Structure formats: structure tokens, C-alpha cells
Ligand binder design. Structure first.
Ligand SMILES: Nc1ncnc2c1ncn2[C@@H]1O[C@H](COP(=O)(O)OP(=O)(O)O)[C@@H](O)[C@H]1O
Ligand SMILES: Nc1ncnc2c1ncn2[C@@H]1O[C@H](COP(=O)(O)OP(=O)(O)O)[C@@H](O)[C@H]1O
Ligand SMILES: Nc1ncnc2c1ncn2[C@@H]1O[C@H](COP(=O)(O)OP(=O)(O)O)[C@@H](O)[C@H]1O
Ligand SMILES: Nc1ncnc2c1ncn2[C@@H]1O[C@H](COP(=O)(O)OP(=O)(O)O)[C@@H](O)[C@H]1O
Ligand SMILES: Nc1ncnc2c1ncn2[C@@H]1O[C@H](COP(=O)(O)OP(=O)(O)O)[C@@H](O)[C@H]1O
Ligand SMILES: [Mg+2]
Ligand SMILES: [Mg+2]
Ligand SMILES: [Mg+2]
Ligand SMILES: [Mg+2]
Ligand SMILES: [Mg+2]
Lengths: 375, 375, 375, 375, 375
């Protein structure tokens, strides 16, 4: 802390929560965010008569308690129950009071106005923040790696982004709030397993099936060929183990799951497509300036990690876009941390002290002000 | 038969088997499907030294022989032993060879892939089907009553469906394979009887307790009030008789049994709820097109018959769904026969001859093909 | 005999012996089985210096020689001395060698294992049986009258049975080896006579008092009333004559003697009761299947003949068992012959030739084998 | 007693009664529970003209008086006559009035509702309990040994349990009220002795044959091999002595008796099987959480003591359950006392004072309330 | 007498009569019971012209008057003539009127019903008994010596008993009315004397020969050896004197006479045997309870006194009965008085006043009532 407090940073992405102090490599503490209640009554009293919350222990005990995601698609529907997640985050992982160290809140772009004003009140009023700013998901990634120019994609468990940013300026013509996420992607996985005869349907049950994809999955550069080849032989079949109960085998569904990200045709919505999506945003920008963006494409966030993301993405973007154009995915191994890390850099980079807002100003001004001055 | 054979239809639901010829009102022969063996040895020889199978006679003699359901949750685990059920159905009830008259097989949606390919081989190879198609449970109901547009629910002894179908098209976003059934519902009944001091636990024993619910049961429009009122007085108590052994009385447990269908909270799983379930499927459809579905809701199948199913279902759907919306259950007195009857209409409706598959094509193509072209 | 020998059948019940050839109405020769020695020495030599055995002549000469029952409660304690009974039976009544014509042995169920294995050796080794099978008392009755389904009671001079048999199968949950018999019943008679001032105590003496009951006795539908009414007047008193010595009169003890069969309370053991006993066996059967047994109750054997057995048995079974249930005693006038006759039917009913066992197989296998394959 | 009374605990299992004060090692007084009347009249008057009850002295004098078990399968059919057992227990063994020291009642789970409400009235009204709670058999075991997590089996003389409990919570999906017990197991023993030629049939007679098994019996890890080996030689035969009358020898039936517990196939019911039974309960639990239960299996109660219970149980559970899974029986030498001891811990563990119920509350509320708040 | 009369007790065994007042050591007056008439006419008149009766004087004058035993085997055949015996007993030995002091009648168990009802009338009507009870021979012995538990044998001049009694209760399964007595035993003596050339045959003649056995006799532990040894030498021969007429010598027949009691093989009836008899009664009792009876065997009555009764009885009971069992004869030197003395104790032991019956009750009720309430 010293004479002047460090900059506390909190990710609050959608399902995964990242927290910590001023610009520091890797977040101080990471844990999934859930806060449900136990399914039914237990005979014992006073030994286990206490609620399981905020992942971690609650996360470990999946079977007894149903887990609920407080926020969907980067939108907080739960609100009040969610606040405890921050409550747990501040005391424990950080073990610091909200009023002392300034914290950077992170909010997904193009979401209801209410979420940002109300979020401020919860943190600002209940926690009397010493200094705070509602951050934008896509911008922070740029601060980290990828220099200061390019297009960033941060598909997550609830929300995905594709915002074009040139130099110190970013054009708002094609932000692209696609209704896709690793979470719902997981659901598709649950439905397809029926193919293998496995059935999963519950909050904890979903948790177990979730990650299976992380461990097992291929983007497949030529997709079409993959189904015809994988179906032909075991090759990519391999195996995985399901906790105690059984041993599951991820047939050729192992590579088809990732495609919905690329073309929701399988899921059922033709609204967007990753190779088709990244392209539209870049087109709705100055025709003269796109070269800097084509070669500055950087993928950071969830699903980005997915095995071979850059590979399929790379070939497709080239197909639709004109030749003689240099296109790169600049996908870093440290990706997925852009939101917290990049944000941390901005927070404790001094000379940027004025942008942060605190007590007094907000009290004299309407909740609209906190939302104002943000972009 | 004539110059060209009629269309033989076979339900093969899960526990109840329906069979017959081309689109004919009501199925030709109905009987429960079981095929277990006698519990122990009998001294007599040659007079009773023959196995009791395929319900009917086997069904009548419940005490001496344990009955097993060859398929659970619309999933065939037994496979080979089950085939005799069809064997008995073909010779006796229909008394027609499998090679001559074309038959429509019925299969529950979102089940293991293996069931459909393997089922084909058994019927296709062992019976050399002249023509056949693996049907879908939910679709056939629409063909019968309810016009050509709406949402159908066919809760059965093993599997339940809630698939939204608009016009000649159906959206696959929320089929809903709930893990509920009249059968397991029966088990709950067996456990609650302990309340009255009655104990039942065996295949035949379950059979007797099974149907008791059919004879005695109320959905209860306001449930909460029912326990408080029914417990207060005898009113709904009435009575029932148990074969020779005693006379049982279905206390206030008479109306509580049906609720688990509505809210498995009592059974112990919070995954689904009828009023909550039907709603989710409709929501996961085009926001603009839902009105046709709200007013075209039709319930056909087991448990649907349950006294007052439409009543409780009706009021609850209206509560969660927005006002000014017209919702109906279009529950027909002939329901439960949609699978066979509706199917029969499709089978012998001509101009649909090409969809049916037969010998030669399958032999030249992999078992995958029979599974293919189906949806 | 012809090219292939007929089926010789031997009852060997407990005190009464029945023998004969293949399924023939009524047994070839009947006589009580005893084989004791003369009480003391006679002066004459060579004219009467020969032992009196195997009833008949020995039976006629009761005073000079004490008679012993080789088997008690269907259990052979004497063993070796008993074999002569068969010896006499084979040569004389049947006048056929044991090695030629195949014979069916009869054994009481739930008795020591030794009796059946040892019995085989005596007949199998000493007599080299051409073919034989150790039969079960209760089963044979079913073959005769009573169809193929029901419960049979064969109370005898040593052993009684109550085995429930459904169709070609019989459940072993409640065979019921009650420790009751007409013989010991006789003893009760001897003790009660003291009431009338008559004293009997010896093997021959017991023989005379035995049968008296057969000639004089009433089951009494309302028992309680009988003692109060019979004591009031002579009515049922009537009379009987005792060979030469005196003329006895069977007071009201005439109807009380049969009750001990129904309730050994008088004899002194509360273990079983006929009305209470038949009921327990049926209850320990499938709850669903009991109706066939209630209406198929058939009494065959000793004491069954007793005057009015069906009458008292009839009303009582109805009292404890639930109403609306049809119960019958199906007591045939030819009863008591079920063991031999029914058995004879099974023996010479062909197509049942494989079950019979003979020389060679037993020699190569242990005595346990003869016991095995039996049930 | 002091200023505040200690916690009196009463087992009331089914045949064996345990009683005592607040959480104390081993129960204060143990004795079997029976309360029958003498078989017949004795000439002497005023010296022995007094009834023999509540085991102990009554138990010692088995021949003269028939003993009846007031409760079967954890179900009280006798009710009123049974109350004296508690009457004897309170005065004598404890020698304390029911109104002063609070007592914990023990009731078998999944039994008629009436037993728990009526039991309360008898103790609550007739004894005006200062404080009481109707306990659950399975839960208490957990409190003692086995930590706070696992699956417990407490097979007894009338009722058996297999309830899965995780942490301070227990799932009710598979409690498993198997219709098995040490008592009925004894009956099987009585029927098989006929093999050795020994006959037993009466309340006292049963008592003598009962315990014989305790003294002589083997679970047999490979069963099949045991019959083939034991029959081959005397080895396991050994010997036992029957009071005065004779000396019995427990042939190879010594190890077969325990199997019916494992597979009632011998008894005649295929409803359950120990290795098959423990498995089903664990399966009907969260798929993710079962590891804690597999390694936390603890057997406490009757028949559990049976020689080698853990051995056979151990290998079989491992066979059907998937590999790589750690399974233990955590069978303690002090087992069988879990019901009383574990219960005593809960009773006198303070901070659990509110759960106990007393006078006033029950009087103002219906008997349903005492049943309510229990689980 | 005082304000309330003492309890008069009358043995009336069979040949010997015992009489007296309330529980007093040793009977007040003892004398054999006979009442015959003089053989022929005497010339003298008025000096000896009076009948000789009721033993004593009549007994002294054996030659002139033939003596008749009014009762045989504990059965009164004479009836009317016998009453004078009581007539003489009441006036003379007791010198008290029958109406004043209450008296206890003694009756042998398992005798004709008539003897007990008719006996009541004679005493009750002719004597108007102030209070009376028909006692049982065997029970009274227990009251005296031998505690309250055991088996008693009271072989007498006409009747013998072997009734097992446990605690205040006695089981009726094997009372054992053996047809043996010291009297008939005497006859055997008369016949064997022919061996020595002595002839005796008349009522008085029998009296003289009777007692000779009392004075001279050995039970002989090894019997067989005794004939072989005694015949070898004079040893046991010794001598006796016959009144005036001659001096007889009891050769080796001295020890053989007692054996018939043990085995009537010599007399001619194989019905019973002392060592074999005591054993059967104990066996026909609860198998579990026999130990108390084996060690509580007590012999009281006639022939019991016989020299060495306990010796032979002791070794033999041990031979047939299983080892490790403690058996005793608890034969008291005061035995033979159990019937009167033991009875007297019961009579004047107060609190047992209700059992006694008197005038009024019997008059209003049938003679059957006096017989009723007795056991
Ligand atoms: N290495 C990985 N492989 C596959 N999927 C991943 C991987 N890492 C994260 N994910 C998925 O990314 C989603 C969350 O992404 P992310 O954007 O990083 O979190 P947040 O939005 O909370 O900041 C989840 O559905 C998760 O399963
Ligand atoms: N009229 C009825 N009332 C209550 N339950 C019924 C009724 N008819 C059928 N059921 C229940 O419905 C289930 C089988 O339903 P169904 O779907 O019609 O058969 P299937 O799946 O074999 O085609 C059973 O559990 C049965 O008990
Ligand atoms: N007609 C009858 N009336 C009374 N008792 C009879 C009659 N017939 C046979 N009994 C009795 O039945 C007993 C023998 O019965 P049974 O079973 O027929 O013979 P077994 O066991 O030798 O085959 C005897 O005690 C006999 O006295
Ligand atoms: N050590 C033992 N060996 C074999 N059986 C035993 C042993 N201990 C108890 N049993 C049996 O367990 C049964 C009673 O068990 P338990 O559950 O402990 O009593 P309760 O149900 O009354 O609490 C009886 O059938 C008894 O014979
Ligand atoms: N001391 C004795 N020695 C041998 N025999 C005796 C003795 N005392 C009595 N007896 C015989 O016992 C018989 C009468 O026995 P008891 O039972 O005592 O008399 P009661 O039946 O009249 O009561 C007579 O035959 C008598 O001779
Ligand atoms: Mg993110
Ligand atoms: Mg169906
Ligand atoms: Mg018979
Ligand atoms: Mg217990
Ligand atoms: Mg006497």
C-alpha cells in the first residue's frame, strides 16, 4: 500500500473471475464464479449446516449444491446474489478492503446501460471505492501484447468481441456483439454425447462435461475432410476418463464441436461465423486503412486457447479477403489474460490517474455520470 | 396384402408395444412388453416346463416369473432378448412374416446412435424388411390430431418429449429429452406407500402397484392447497382394492404423486419441471414465431391421460408466459395413440413411398446409411 | 412285463405300505408295516417256532408279538430291520424281483438327507433297481385329482404336508413339516380314555385302540358348542365294541380328539394349527398369485378321511382370509391314495423316462448324486 | 442429574434393546426384547404364579413361556404389549422415571408413518417425556466412527439399511429398505438343519438355534468353491454343543447360511443382494460425487459382526464397480453399537438442544408435528 | 380347633391310609386299609359276633377274616364298602366329625373321572365337608422336600407316578401312569417262592409274605452279575423267620424281585422300565429346559424305600442320558411321607384358602364342578 495505494484489478469476465493488485504479471487469484444453494436437507447439524459459495470449495462440492452463473452473455441478471462473489474475492484471495485499494472493474461492451450504472452503485456505495473505472474488455487486450494497433477477438464463456482499433483511436462501426460463448458451446457438447449414449443435465453435471472439450478438441483446418476421415478410422478418437463413474470416448465429435464457433449453422443460428465475422468488422472501417488491421489481428480470451484456433482462422480469413494482403492472427500463448493483465497495465501506468473516479464526485452527480466519460 | 402390400406399423414405445397394418384406426394388438424367466424350479415336467414371455400370458403369471423391461428411457440395453418381443408380435397378433408387409419402426429422439443402426440390422437382416423407416416419436403425433403446427408432449413409461414443430418445419434448438417417465413415477409411489404401511418390491409386485395410480390420482390445480385440505379430511381418500391379499387406501398421496412430473423436486432432481419445461423449448425458437406454438400445444402419450393433466398444465403455462397470449393444451381423449395412429397415417399416405428403405440399398451401403436420411 | 417292464410303485408312507405296478387304479396290495418280535417263549417247537413279521399275519397276532413302527415322522430310524418290509412286499404281494421291474420310492420332504441316500443304497445295491426315483409325497397328489394347480395337505400317521404348487412350478418358501400325525393323535386318545376308565398301553394294545377313532369321530364345525352340547346329552355318544373283552363307549371325547390336529393346544404344543397352518403357507407366496391356490386347496392322505374334515377346515380358512375370496377344500372320496395313485401316473406316463435313475450311473457317481437331481 | 438432566438414550432396534444415559461409552444395559406368556398351567400357586417378561428372566426360562417379538422388520405390530419393555427398561436397568431424564427414541427409516406418531404418544403422553427426538438408525452410525462422510449398512434382526450420506447432507434417492434380517436368516438355518436331521420349531426353540450361527459361520470369499471344498472334507465342520439334549455338528451349511444375505436366491427372493445392493444406492447419487462414498463405506449393526463380513463384501463391490476406484468397508470391531453410541453422542453434544421436543408444544400441536421436523 | 378350624389331611393312597390335622410333621395315625368279612361261622355268640374291619384289629386277625383292598391301582372299584375306612379314620384315629375340620382328599392322577366326582359326593354329601380339595399325588411331594423344581416318582402299592414339574408350572406331556405297584410286586414274590418250596395264597397269607421283601431285598447295581454271584455263594442269602409255622430263607430271589419294577420283562410286560421310564417323561419336555429336571429328580413313596433304590436308579439314568449332565435322585430318608406331609403344608399354608371348596357352591353346581378347577 505504502503512502499511496496500488491499483487493484478485477476481471469479472462472465464465469471466470480474475483479481489482484496494480499491474502484476498473471492475476493474484483465479477461480470460477458460481453461488448456488444445496439441493436438499442433510441430517447432520452445525458441522455442514453452512452454505457452499463462490466456487472453490463450492466448486469442489458440485454434487450436493447446484451452481448458477450470476451473469449471462456478459449481462448480470442476478445482480444482488452476484455481489457476494466480489465479497468473497475482496476478503480471502485479496484480503483487502474495497475502500482502501482502488480497483478496476471490467464490463463487456454493448450491454444494457443499467449493468454499468448499477454495478457502480454496488461497488461505489456498498464498497465506497477509493478510485475505480468501468473497463472495456477488448481495449485492454491491446495494451498487453499486439502493440497498439489491430483487431482483437476475446470469445468467452458468455460474450465474444471483435472490435477494430487503430493507433490510439478505435472505430465503433462494427463492434460485433456475437451471441456466442464457450459455455453455450458446452451445451452443444452435452447434446451430442447422446450419440455416444452418455447423458448429462445439471449444474454440476455440466461442470464435469465442461473442460472435457478443453482437454479434447481439434479445430480442423479442412473440416469437411475431418468428418469423412475421422469417421473412417479411430485416429483422433483417443480417450478420456470421467470421474469414477465411467470412461468416456470422444469420437469424431471431438473436432465438430469447435465449428459452431466458426459457423453456428450446427447450433442453428446463421447470424454469425468467425471467419465471416472478423471480416465484416474490418470492412466497415476506412477502405484506405485496413492493412494495419489485417496483419494486427490478435486473439485473446477463452475458446481462443482451443487447440488450433489460429490455424483454421488463418486460412479462412485469407480466402474471402483479397490476395496480396498480409494477414496474421498474432495469437499469444499467454492470451486469455489480456483482460486482467492488459487492464492492470492501464491501471498502474500513472499519468492516467485523472480518468479514475471516486467518492464525492459520484455523490454530487447522478449514476449517469459514472456511465458517462466512459468509452 | 393384394398386389402391393399394406403398411405394417409397430410402436415399440418403451414398455407398451403397439402393432398393426397400414393406417388403421386404433392399433391391431396392444400388450405390455416384458420377457423375463421363472424365479425357481417346479416339480412338474412337460406340462409347465415352457417359458413365459412377451407379457400377455407371461404378464398374467406375474408371481412365478420376474418381468424385465428390455428398454429403459427409450434406450435398448437388452437388445438381443428384446427381439423376441417383435418375434412374438409378428407371429400371433399380426401373424404376418416380417419380409412381406413393410413396417414402420418407432425410435425415441436424441438417443444413442447405436440403437437406431443396430435395430435396423436386427429387423433388416434377421427379418429382411420389404420396406422400413425408423420413425420419430414426436412428429407422428402432429400428423394425427393438432393439425400440422404446434408443440407436442408425449411423456411415457421411459421417455418424454417436448419438440416444437412449425408448419412443415421443426426447429432442433430445444427438443428436451427429460429423464422422466410414468414407470419411474411408479417407483415413487412404491416408496410413499410405506406411509400407509404397505411394502412392494419385485417385478410382478411393481406391476400390481403400477396402474393403481392410473385408477387413483389427481393433478391438483393448486397443489399446495391440496395437501393442506386433503390432510384435513377424507374427501379425496376414497378406496381401492388389492388383489385378494388386502384392501389398500390411497390417502392424500393420491394427488402428490403426479407433481414430480411437474417438479422433480420431490423425486430429488431439479433439472426439469413440466410447466417450466414446455416454456423453455418454445422460448428457444424464433421470438417472432411462438404464437402459433402457444395455442397449438398438444399432449399425447402416457401420463398425459393422467386425470386433470390439461388443468394444471393450463394455468401454469399462462403464469410464466406473458399476458395477452392465447395458450391451449389441445389434449385429445384419443391421445396416447398418436405414436401408432399418427405413424400409420404417414406410412400408408402414399406419395411418401420414396423415404422408406429396403433390402439391396442397405446391403450395398453401411449401417450408417439407414441412420442417415433420418430426421 | 413284455419287452419293456412296467413301472412298479411303492408308497412306503410311514406306517401304511402301498405297492404295485405301473399306473393302475388303486394299489396292488395294502398292509400296515410293522416288524417286531414275540414277547416271550412258547413250549411248542417247530410248529410256531418262526417269527411273525410285516403286519398281515403278524398284524393279526398282535398279543403275542410287540409291533414296532420302523419309521417315525417320515424318518427311518430302524433302517436295516425295515428293509424286510420291502423284502416281504416284493415277494408275495407283488411277487416280482426288485431288479426286473422299475419301482418308484416315496420319501417325505424336508427330512434328513441321509434317509434318501441310504434308502437308495439299500434298494439300489441290495436290490440292483432297473430304474428308480425317490418321489416327493405332496407333488404326486396334484398329478391325480385337483388338476395341476393348488395346495395339498396329506397329514399321515407320522408326517403331514402343506406345500403350495402353482402350475408346473412350486414355491419352497413354506413347505411346512408340521410335527403331527394320526399315530401320535392316537396316543392322545389313549390318554383320554382314562376319563372313561379304560387303560391301554402296548404295541398291540395301541393297534386296537387305533381305528376306534376312524370308526368314531366328529370334527365339529363350532367345537366350543360341541363340548357344551355333547356333555349336556348322550346324542353323539352312541357306542362301539372292543374285541371280546368289553364294550367301550366313546363319550364326548369322540369329537375333541380331532381338534389337536387343528390346534395342538390340547396336546401341548402351540407351534401349528391346521386352519392357522394352511394359511401361513399361502401367505408366503407371491401376493398377486394366491387366488389360484385358495380355490385349489385339496386334502389327500390320512386323517383327511376323518369324518367332516372339509367342514371345519372350510369355515375357518374363510374367517382369517379376506372376504370376496373363493376358497375350496376339493376333498375327494378317493383321497388318501394320491401318494400311490398319483405317483403311478407319473411313473408310467412315458416321456418322463429320463428322470428315472439306474445301475451304472449311480456306481460311477457318489450316493450324493441320487439325492441330487431330485426336487 | 444435577441442575440439568443428562440425555437418556434408548435403542429399541427390533429385537435387542439398548438403554442408558447421555453420551456414554457402551450402553448402560442390554437385553433381548420379548414379552410372551407361559404355555400352560402349573399346579403350584403364589410361588411361580407371576408372569415372565422382558427377556432376562423370561429369556432364561424359554421352555415354559413362548416368546414373541413385539416388532417385525422395524415395524411395531404389537404396540400396546411392547410398551412394557420400555416400562421394564426405565425401571430396573435405568431405574429412572421417564418424565425426568430426556430420552432419545430410535426409529427405522421408511416405515409406516403411524409407528412414529403413535410411539410419540405412548412415550410423550404415558411417560410425559421432558425432552425427546425420534432418531434415524443410519445417521447415528456416522456420528460415531467413519467420520462424517460415507455409506452405512446396519443389517439387523428385522431391518437393514444402506443410506448414502455426504458431508452434513444425505441424499434420499436410494435409502434401500431391504426385507432382510438376522432373525429371518435364523429361520433359514432352522430349515437346513433337517439336512442333519435336527428339528426345531417354537419361540424358545428358535432362541437356542439362534446364536448358533453367531458361534459358527463363514462368509466365504469364493462361495462356489466352499461348497465343493467343504463337502470334500471335514475341515470347516468342527463342532458345537446343544444344551444337554444332544451335540449338533454344523456341516458345510455353516458357510451357506450367510449368503442369503448376499443373495436371497436361496431364500427365494431375488429383490436384493448385498454386493448388488450397496452398489445401486451409490449409483443413484451425483455421478461426480461417489468417490467419497466408495472409500467411506462403513458396516455397523447386526449380522455385520458375522465372521468375515468385510472380506466377501470387499472383493465383490470391487468387481461390479469400475477400476481405479478405492473402496473400503471401514468395519469397526465396536460396530453394532453405532445406533446407541452414535446416538448418545448426538443427544449430549449440546448446541443441539433446540431439535429435541417436549410437553406443551406437542399438546398444542397435532401428533403430526412430532413426526414433522424429523429427517 | 379355636375360632377357625385346622386343616385335616387324609392320604388315602391305595392300601396305606394316612390321616391328621393341619400341616403337622408325620401323620397323626397310620394303618393299612382293608375291610373284608370272616371266612366262616364260629359257635360262640355275642363275644366275637362282631365284624373285623379297617385293618388294625382286623389286620391283626388275618387268619379268620379275608382282607380285601377297596382300591386297585389308585382306582376305587369297591366304593361304598370303602367309605367305612374313612368312617373309622374320622372316628378313632382323628376322633373328629367330618363337618367341622376341613380335610384334604388325595387322588391319583390320570384315573377315571368318576372316582373324583363320586368321592366328592360321598365326603361332601355324607360328611358335609366344611372345606375340601381333591389333591394330586405327585405335586404334594414337591412342596415338602426337593424345593419347587424337579421330577418326582412315587411308586406305591397300586399306582406309580413320574410327573415333570418346573418352577410353579408342570408340563402334562408325560405324566406316566405305569401299571406297577409294590402290591403286585408282592405277587411275583409269592410265585417265586415255589422255587424254595413255599406256598402262599390268600388275603392274610399274602399279608404275611408282604413285608418280607421290605425286610429282605437288594436292588443290585449290576443285576446280571448278582445272579451269577449270589447263585455261586450263600453271601446275601442270610435268613428270615415266618411266624411260628416255619423259618423261610430268601435265597438269591432276594435281589431279583426289585428288578421287575425296573424292567417288567420278568413279570411279563415290556410296557415300561424305571430307568427307561423316568427318561421318557423328561424327554417329552422343552429340550432347552431339562437340566433343572435331571438334577432335581426326587423319589418319594412306597418301594422308593426299598434298599438301594437310588443306587441302581442313579447309574442307569446316567447311561442312556447324554454325558456332562448332572443327574441326582435327591432321595430323602423321610420320603414316602411326601403325599401326606407335603399335602399338609399346602393345606395349612393360608393364602391358599380360596382353592378349597365347600357346601353351597357344590349344591348349586353339578358334581362336575368339584372335578373342575382341579389340576
Ligand atoms: N484452454 C482452454 N481450452 C478450451 N477452452 C477454454 C480454455 N480456457 C478457457 N476456455 C473456455 O473459455 C471460456 C471462458 O473464457 P474467458 O473469456 O477466458 O473468461 P472470462 O470471460 O470469465 O474472462 C469457458 O467456456 C472455458 O471453458
Ligand atoms: N390412462 C392412464 N392413466 C395414468 N397413466 C397411464 C395411462 N395410460 C398410460 N399410462 C402410463 O403411461 C406410461 C406408458 O406410456 P406411453 O407413452 O403411452 O407408452 P409407450 O411409451 O410404450 O408408447 C406408463 O407408465 C403407464 O402406466
Ligand atoms: N378313514 C380314516 N379315518 C380316520 N383316520 C384314518 C382313515 N384312514 C387312515 N387314517 C389314519 O391316517 C394315518 C395314516 O395315513 P396315510 O397318510 O394315509 O398313510 P401313509 O402315511 O402310510 O401313506 C393313520 O393314523 C390312520 O389311522
Ligand atoms: N456377533 C454376531 N454374530 C452373528 N450375528 C450377530 C452378532 N451380533 C448380533 N448378531 C445378529 O444381529 C441381529 C440383531 O442386530 P442389531 O442390529 O445389532 O440389533 P438391533 O436391530 O435390535 O439394534 C440378530 O439376528 C443377531 O443374532
Ligand atoms: N420300607 C419299605 N421297603 C419296601 N417296601 C415298602 C416300604 N415301605 C412301603 N413299602 C411298600 O410300598 C407300598 C405302599 O406304598 P405307598 O405309596 O407309600 O403307600 P400309599 O400308596 O397307600 O400312599 C407297599 O407295597 C409297601 O409294601
Ligand atoms: Mg473475457
Ligand atoms: Mg411413446
Ligand atoms: Mg402319506
Ligand atoms: Mg439396528
Ligand atoms: Mg402314594
Amino acid at each position: 500500500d505504502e503512502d499511496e495505494t496500488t491499483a487493484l484489478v478485477c476481471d469479472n469476465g462472465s464465469g471466470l473471475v480474475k483479481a489482484g493488485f496494480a499491474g502484476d504479471d498473471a492475476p493474484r487469484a483465479v477461480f470460477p464464479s458460481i453461488v448456488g444453494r444445496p439441493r436438499h436437507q442433510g441430517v447432520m447439524v452445525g458441522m455442514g449446516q453452512k452454505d457452499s459459495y463462490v466456487g472453490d470449495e463450492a466448486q469442489s462440492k458440485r454434487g450436493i449444491l447446484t451452481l448458477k452463473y450470476p451473469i449471462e452473455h456478459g449481462i448480470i441478471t442476478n445482480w444482488d446474489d452476484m455481489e457476494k462473489i466480489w465479497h468473497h474475492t475482496f476478503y480471502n484471495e485479496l484480503r483487502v478492503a474495497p475502500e482502501e485499494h482502488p480497483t478496476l472493474l471490467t464490463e463487456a461492451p454493448l450491454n444494457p446501460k443499467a449493468n454499468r450504472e448499477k454495478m457502480t452503485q454496488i461497488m461505489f456505495e456498498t464498497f465506497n471505492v477509493p478510485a475505480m473505472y468501468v473497463a472495456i474488455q477488448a481495449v485492454l487486450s491491446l495494451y498487453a501484447s499486439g502493440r497498439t494497433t489491430g483487431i482483437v477477438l476475446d470469445s468467452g464463456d458468455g460474450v465474444t468481441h471483435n472490435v477494430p482499433i487503430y493507433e490510439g483511436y478505435a472505430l465503433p462501426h462494427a463492434i460485433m456483439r456475437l451471441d456466442l460463448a464457450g459455455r453455450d458451446l458446452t451445451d452443444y457438447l452435452m447434446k451430442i454425447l447422446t450419440e455416444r449414449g452418455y447423458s448429462f443435465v445439471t449444474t454440476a453435471e455440466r461442470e464435469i462435461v465442461r473442460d472435457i472439450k478443453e482437454k479434447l478438441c481439434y479445430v480442423a483446418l479442412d473440416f469437411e475432410n475431418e468428418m469423412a476421415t475421422a469417421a473412417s478410422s479411430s485416429s483422433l478418437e483417443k480417450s478420456y476418463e470421467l470421474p469414477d463413474g465411467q470412461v468416456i470416448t470422444i469420437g469424431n465429435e471431438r473436432f465438430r464441436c469447435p465449428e459452431t464457433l466458426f459457423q453456428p449453422s450446427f447450433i442453428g443460428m446463421e447470424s454469425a461465423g468467425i471467419h465471416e465475422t472478423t471480416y465484416n468488422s474490418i470492412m466497415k472501417c476506412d477502405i484506405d486503412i485496413r492493412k494495419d488491421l489485417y496483419a494486427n489481428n490478435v486473439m485473446s480470451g477463452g475458446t481462443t486457447m482451443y487447440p488450433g484456433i489460429a490455424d483454421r482462422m488463418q486460412k479462412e480469413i485469407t480466402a474471402l479477403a483479397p490476395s496480396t494482403m498480409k494477414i496474421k492472427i498474432i495469437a499469444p500463448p499467454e492470451r486469455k489474460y489480456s483482460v486482467w493483465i492488459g487492464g492492470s497495465i492501464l491501471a498502474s501506468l500513472s499519468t492516467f490517474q485523472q480518468m479514475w473516479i471516486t467518492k464525492q464526485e459520484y455523490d454530487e452527480a447522478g449514476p449517469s455520470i459514472v456511465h458517462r466519460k466512459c468509452f
